Amino acid sequence: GQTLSSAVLTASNTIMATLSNVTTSTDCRAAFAYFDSNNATKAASPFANCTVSGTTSVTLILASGVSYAAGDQLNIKVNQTTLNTTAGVPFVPAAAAAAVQPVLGAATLTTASSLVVKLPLSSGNTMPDGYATNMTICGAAVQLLSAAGAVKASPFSACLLAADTLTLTLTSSGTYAPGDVVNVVAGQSTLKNGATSYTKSAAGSVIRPTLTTVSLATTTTILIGASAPVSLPANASADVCNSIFTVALKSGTALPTALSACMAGPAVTAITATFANGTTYSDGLTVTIKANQTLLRTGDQSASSPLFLPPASALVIAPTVLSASLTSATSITVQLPVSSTASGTLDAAGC
């Protein structure tokens, strides 16, 4: 609390400070002042609330009407008595104000070979020209690390950036794995944040798989395709299954009970559960993981492994056909589940 540097800026309205000594402080709100590198003053009381957020960290949530700027600086204010080290020393104003610097936003693996990452700040992000085709440019922005910390040898191929969104596409050789993490490398000169740059974060972001497609496995069951190897509780109970996949009628009314049992699929990245849509049983059914899901995990059922994030919106259970049977020497008849429609001419070329 006399001279320190670091911090993690996670969103457009929240900061956190990293310090040397552990603390049990309850309040920090009125213990900081805001300037910039240009020396134009900012929020006198930048923060509305504080709580302990780590071994030594103090979270500092910005109040309304405040947005980040390059080289933002935060310094301890006068006569602050709530924040203290466990040694009994309250913070005093520092000779050099700490610099607020960013850290990447959330991440999710929408497709088995695409990684999408949001960013803490939605403007100013720029990179050296050639990032769209140079692995020396895109690949130097973020490091991909196993659970043990073994960085991967350029599993990426390209980077795509626009406003607050960023995207890194894997490769066939660089096949994805469960339980991996992504974090920035120290001093990387590629990714900027306006008139600033991005610096490695405290813990990184653990990648989570998700859902991609759904269909009818049998006449009364449904297959579910996943972007990573799946795992479910052994011989799970019906209640467990009903607490994961929220299932809604065509217009959006919920279905309290849809599944009787849930278990793995033909492949390690597939699942099969009871009931079906086929536009029977609802005529429009859709599936989606619940917001606060608990039990659908990848790699294993361990607590550390990532969860399956819910998709962007509910997936539509994709229908199939029932059977075909020869009747005459010039005709086959095919049963289709419940009514259907035709969108065009049924000429020989069309069929």
Residue numbers in the entry: 29 to 379
Can I see the authors' text?
Instead, we purified FMG1B from C. reinhardtii cilia by concanavalin A affinity chromatography and performed single particle cryoEM analysis. The resulting ≈3 Å structure of FMG1B revealed the molecule as a long, twisted chain of 34 individual globular subdomains of 109.6 ± 10.9 amino acids and one cysteine‐rich coiled domain. The individual subdomains fold into an Ig‐like fold with each two orthogonal beta‐sheets and one short alpha helix, which we call beta chunk repeats (BCR). We modeled the semi‐rigid structures composed of the chained BCRs to high confidence, while the flexible nature of the cysteine‐rich domain resulted in a lower local resolution density which, together with the absence of bulky, recognizable amino acids, could not be assigned confidently. The C‐terminus of FMG1B consists of an ≈100 amino‐acid long intrinsically disordered region (IDR) linker followed by a multi‐helix transmembrane domain (TMD). Due to the inherent flexibility of the linker region, no densities could be resolved for either the linker region or the TMD. Despite the high sequence variability between individual BCRs, every BCR contained a single highly conserved disulfide bridge as confirmed by MS‐assisted disulfide detection, while no disulfide bridges were detectable in the cysteine‐rich domain under our conditions. Interestingly, we observe protruding densities by cryoEM that cannot be explained by the primary peptide sequence. Strikingly, we find a near‐perfect correlation between the identified candidate sites and the unexplained electron densities. As such, we were able to directly confirm 25 glycosylation sites of FMG1B, which were mostly located to the 16 n‐terminal and the 9 c‐terminal BCRs, all of which were in proximity to each other on one side of the FMG1B molecule.
